[PDB]
Symmetry: C3
Subunit: 642 residues, 3 copies
Amino acid sequence: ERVFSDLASMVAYPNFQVQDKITLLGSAGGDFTFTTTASVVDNGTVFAVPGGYLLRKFVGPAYSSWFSNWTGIVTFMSAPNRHLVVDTVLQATSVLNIKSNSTLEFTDTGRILPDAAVARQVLNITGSAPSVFVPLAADAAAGSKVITVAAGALSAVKGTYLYLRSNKLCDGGPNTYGVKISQIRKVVGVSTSGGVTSIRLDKTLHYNYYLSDAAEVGIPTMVENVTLVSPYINEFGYDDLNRFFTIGISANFAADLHIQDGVIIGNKRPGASDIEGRSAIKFNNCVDSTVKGTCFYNIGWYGVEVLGCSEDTEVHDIHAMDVRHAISLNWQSTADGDKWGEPIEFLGVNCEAYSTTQAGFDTHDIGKRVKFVRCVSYDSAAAGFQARTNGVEYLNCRAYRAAMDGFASNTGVAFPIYRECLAYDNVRSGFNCSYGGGYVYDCEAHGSQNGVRINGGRVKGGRYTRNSSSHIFVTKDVAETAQTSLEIDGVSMRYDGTGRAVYFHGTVGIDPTLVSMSNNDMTGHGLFWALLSGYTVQPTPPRMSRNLLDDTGIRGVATLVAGEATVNARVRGNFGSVANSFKWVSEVKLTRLTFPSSAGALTVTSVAQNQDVPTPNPDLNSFVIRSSNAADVSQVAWEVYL
Amino acid sequence: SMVAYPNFQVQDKITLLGSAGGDFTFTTTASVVDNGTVFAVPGGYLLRKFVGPAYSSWFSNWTGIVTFMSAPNRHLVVDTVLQATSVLNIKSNSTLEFTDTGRILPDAAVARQVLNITGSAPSVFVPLAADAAAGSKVITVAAGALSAVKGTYLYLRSNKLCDGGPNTYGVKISQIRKVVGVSTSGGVTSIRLDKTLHYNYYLSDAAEVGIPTMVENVTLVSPYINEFGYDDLNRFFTIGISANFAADLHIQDGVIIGNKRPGASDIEGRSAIKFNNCVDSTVKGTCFYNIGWYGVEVLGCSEDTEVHDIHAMDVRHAISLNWQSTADGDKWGEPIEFLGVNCEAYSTTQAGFDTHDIGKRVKFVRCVSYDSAAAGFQARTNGVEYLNCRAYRAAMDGFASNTGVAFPIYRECLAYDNVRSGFNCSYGGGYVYDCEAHGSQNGVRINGGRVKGGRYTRNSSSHIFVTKDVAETAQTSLEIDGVSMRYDGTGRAVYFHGTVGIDPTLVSMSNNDMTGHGLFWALLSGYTVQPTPPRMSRNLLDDTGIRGVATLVAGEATVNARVRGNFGSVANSFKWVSEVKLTRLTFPSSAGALTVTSVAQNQDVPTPNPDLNSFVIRSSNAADVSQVAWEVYL
Amino acid sequence: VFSDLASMVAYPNFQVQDKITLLGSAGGDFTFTTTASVVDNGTVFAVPGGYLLRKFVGPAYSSWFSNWTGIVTFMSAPNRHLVVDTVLQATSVLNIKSNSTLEFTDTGRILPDAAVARQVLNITGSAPSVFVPLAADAAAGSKVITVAAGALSAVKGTYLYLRSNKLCDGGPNTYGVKISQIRKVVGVSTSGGVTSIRLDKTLHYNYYLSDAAEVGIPTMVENVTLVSPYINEFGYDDLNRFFTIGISANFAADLHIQDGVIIGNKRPGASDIEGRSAIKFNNCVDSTVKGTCFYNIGWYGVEVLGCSEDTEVHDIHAMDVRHAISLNWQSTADGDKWGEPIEFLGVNCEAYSTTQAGFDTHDIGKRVKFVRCVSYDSAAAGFQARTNGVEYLNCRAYRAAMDGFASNTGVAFPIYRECLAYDNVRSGFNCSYGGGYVYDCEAHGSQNGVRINGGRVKGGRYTRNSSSHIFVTKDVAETAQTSLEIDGVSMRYDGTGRAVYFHGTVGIDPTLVSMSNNDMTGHGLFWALLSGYTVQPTPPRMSRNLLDDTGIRGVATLVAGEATVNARVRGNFGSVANSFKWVSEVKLTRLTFPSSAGALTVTSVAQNQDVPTPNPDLNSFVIRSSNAADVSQVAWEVYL
């Protein structure tokens, strides 16, 4: 039974015995056990004394308020299997490394303030790539459950990881840097027969790993099962104290790293220029890792940066304000040598971005199986969403007030897919997939120069309004890009006092006959449903089927007399030869409703359009129904389409 | 008795027993007594020594718990059954967490609120120095007009009216923002905000800004308010958890029960959870039973609010975004950016999921309403979006708008056995995309907009009902495209309501599946003169006798087929006939232009046989011997 | 004070007033008591004269306990919160009771007994011991049920279990499982000899007196939270260390399982073992599994059966299991069974290398939905529906050995919305058993993109399918063909299969199919495949499809009432049984209006037949007028 009023008194005491009950009072107080066994001093949980060590007695988490200084915190977390609650405002003077099976948790008022003297990383979760590789014993196709190596070449330990690579190029996107393939897999079974060890993986392979590509495998060092609960890195007012950092949380070769909530603020001054590499959270070669609920303010580079062969990565519920990209999947520069890995299986869901300096949500030109679900970007300085890898899918995303395009692909990028996405008041376009096609399904764009820019693919369903030039702009990024077939079907693209329905860009080589337009609502555009520019000669129109161009004077019944009737109706057409125009006429569907013996074959002719000045009256447009039988007196139903 | 003890000295080492007691320190420094972590004793105070959370079991009384929570930076674990006699206020950077056994029983002597999380409105406003349009990252005020501290909040308002919906009360705009940057130059202070402005804030509307005192960063973990059996004890409350001017309030799981008797009448204002002027706040997983008013009420300028995974049973609305009555003076704020996801409602006394007539960017995703006494879902603000929601057995409509409300959007929503209709957007248009309605009087009631895709069955009157709430509402164009609305022994495909002035020519019907309806694909009532029909393009009406090949003899062939039409003049009917598509398959020199005539329909005496209906293909060339493929559409 | 526990518990003269401390392992403060206590050797110890109780606030810790037996004893009561901060070696089932939480630190584990395969965690209520008849019919949607006054005592906040002889109606129900539901009492009143019991949730079947509808009081285990359960560990198979069921729940309410890892009740990649599911929910309500990972499981990852209602499975990863998720039937071979799942959500789940279907139901269950789930490398299907009207939203199947998505014998109309199927061997979607609704889906890399006997294929996109994109067929010839709408589908030629294959062998009538506004570009004369017809069948109705991309719109000027137009007009006019007779729809619109304007028609369709490669830029048709003087300019558009 030994009681001490302060730390210095306790640690100077020379008479401790192992059977003693020991108590410290004050801000780091607690109960202690004396031992002679060599213990790792950290001045919070272990203290040196004459004759041995004092060990704080506790179950559950450790608390930062137990520690004398930052140095001790770093020492404590240098070991695995730690649970530390940050319940004080810590002043960092070095990087804090976190090891396997560890949790760092913050209370409402816990903080790590970075060092104002030197910009450095705050939290590191750092594994490493293999130092040596062995060849696969045989090719392993995509979908393989097992890989094989020569017996004894590699220690395969169940529950640990392997890192596979080859010279095959990443294939998710254009991959302009020529990044090579890699994947991280967990060993779940092992068997050896005939000199070959067969290693069963948790997940199957997503590329063909071939010996002709020097397919090989090594053992990485992973940091696994790290939880960061409510990390609070820096604090508002940081810019008045010149207090910054580089990367907030940097992970490399981590597995099951889960980041929940928290706030990461201020590795640049508010509203200031971007700073290369200064991402808030960076996942490099991480597997089964997540960021859920974290908020980001005033970040020099990306909110969450995902690169290398990061696989089964998810970002949910983040709010990112004044950052370069809220989320960016990244490439790796091969300027200085080979690099390996693209992200595979990425989900961003229910995330919000405000005032990004570049695209709200971004990929670079590699990555596979990338999905964004119910994300929203507001007031981007560039695009709301930018896809640079192929076939990125967007489900129910929204972009508001982007300086350029709500959603866009980019040079050489193939067919992003937009489903029920909504674009409002983006300056240039709602959707810009004019670089290499797009699939635009049930989307809406309102308040742009053009609702969609597209060179080929499909615009199916959806609704477009308040677009000053046209609702759909068939164009290219550059003239060299190939136009492909474009279907526009079931789209509501009515006239609302603004632009035309569809703009064909002759300037860059658009052939309108590669477009087909079926069952669209183009009501109100009259003779001005199309905009054309840059044509040297009048081009042939798209195929057009059962579109709606007018809402009045569009169905009725006529009675022939002597084989003919004149019908007043909003029939329409252009019969001129002006180069930037189409020659076209309404499709008038005729059906016979009485059946005299003089019934003949019916046709539409004599289309006249009222050109009263200054205001034309389309209700005095007319056409003639003529029968091949000059005695025809049939009643004929008529319907006017485009 | 520890507190009555005469002679404590600072050095003295201290222990309170009693299984919920502990270790203590003496001090003379002034401390706030709560009889749980701090006690007055002659000469000074005893402070409990602990790290991590406090526990309710440490406190002698509810009043001590209240005093403890009256300060910010508190973490309290409720590990006992607490008997409230006053409101528990929670302040910033605080957590209230309940164990499996912890509970707050409401005050039995006074029905009152249980939890309050209450910030305050600004005490003074200053005008904006310049117009700030929607999308503005910065606002300006005269230098020295107020002190804007980075990390703190601003409350902006003007006389511009909220614009999310009809706004019949004339609620004015407001928003709450966080200061992230401040610069002063040339007598103007420019304040950079976390999030951009969502309205124009104009000097002409007396745009102004003040500093609210927010309660920020509160977490309520598994709140258990009241318990089953409460009604036998006559133990109720008014509002369970009331928050105003809060930021980052997060409520997780828990159960809130019983501010009315089970199945009893509603009580105005008795919401389980109320969010007024709250930002970045959420309710996830909570369960609600026997609530007099709304499960989660959301009002004022609440922005970026989410409700996930709740279950609400015997409540007025599970979720309701609200208006504010301006009868006694101006009010400010509509909700902006609201998500309800994966929520369930049972036996609501009014709509399952609701808005009033203001609110912007409101979305409901995979929510479900069962057995509502009114609608499953009610939109009273404009452009509410519903994704994959479901309504079962509502007493009126599965999904509905209301008077004056524009264009709800329904995407892949499903309506089953709702008495009146699946979807009722007859008040001001609707967009009904790939939806389904089964088991109603009418699948969809709609005055204008779009019904695209989807599938309709078991509707006794008709699948689609083109009508209005009142004859004075405008009919607008209606597209009906790609809809499956087959005959299944019940109603017709489309009902045109002449009584309220519906002009069928404003309707267009393309590529729908109307198989089986025969001559009775349309219902019409209230027409005094036969109306002109909708445009119709390549719909399916029959599945048999609908494609073949005919050979002309002397320019003619008679073809048996399920061709159909009505040629009469009855006011409540359409004159129409099949679209028969003809294509030539052989190419004699006598090939002429082709036409359909002599449509005849069988009228056998018990049941007509449409396989014996016929038409004639006639050529303009009297010697034509062409083979002609024919296909029958509506 | 003491220092080890033989030492503390040997002490012969404890009295109630003593202040006691154990130093070292499992250390803390204690007090003495003479009241009968449940010895657990962690929080309660027997001592000369009575018992020592550990003093603490908040959770207990497994590090406090001398052995597994004590852990089991502690958790045998309700209202327990235990943190597993050690590696526990199980030798018996751990039962968990109401209002309890079992939480694991990253290193905490339960290692199963290597000597005997048994269950690890049990959360076990019980069915009623007695039932009483309903006093009146209670239709679906009822809020209240009635019983004779005094027949049963219904306590607010407790539960009821309702059943009748009516058969479960979610699917084919080949075992004849009967209906049941679990409901919570929220109100009770009695009048005129009848007790009316108000329920939390409404009834989802008609409960009729003619079906012997009855109700009893089950004993539920309620409010159990399992935080990060870690069951078994990698390398278990080297120690022959297995189990049967990992977490088995029956008659539980508000059981919530968060994260954790369950591994190894079979050897890696070994044969399935009947019944050895990782998690099993039987007759559970308002219960969830979120985040859990599963490896090397003999049966199902999550098994859901009985009248489990309002069950959700989110965010799981399952690798080397029979099914990741399976809703189950109950065999009635030895007697009557009751209950089908009602209201089930699977969201954001991932399956790899399942030995059978990735995500599964058997032939009962109502209101089943899978959202954003993904199956990789299934040895059977990615997704299998055996109950009626299972809905799939934005789900993905990759490289299944059979079908990406499939129904099965006697199963009606699964619904696929925006689902994606890649490189599944046989098909992307196989709903050829009983119809399907295939909406905006994609299938790439299969023998056939979709196999279907009736229903709708609407929208979507199909590529790289070796036989055809759509296969109109049946499982067996006895299955009914119903109408099939194919509309708005992109099913272009890309060097692989045809657009649509009509299976005459099983009696497919092509006229029951309608094809409108599809993109069939590139297929030329080979847009259909037919087999097993003995007589040329009549084709589907076709409306405004795209078959060619070049030579498909122009303007012709008639001369003497005719113009020859070179265009990619197409048709087949032969009689070969496995072929259709058909021709392009050429839409004609007059652009000039001479007095000699007559009615227009297409004739003389001529198609180049150069060997080995035909040149369709040499195909032609003639526009002919009824007026031999017609000189009209005529717009022409070529469709299928």
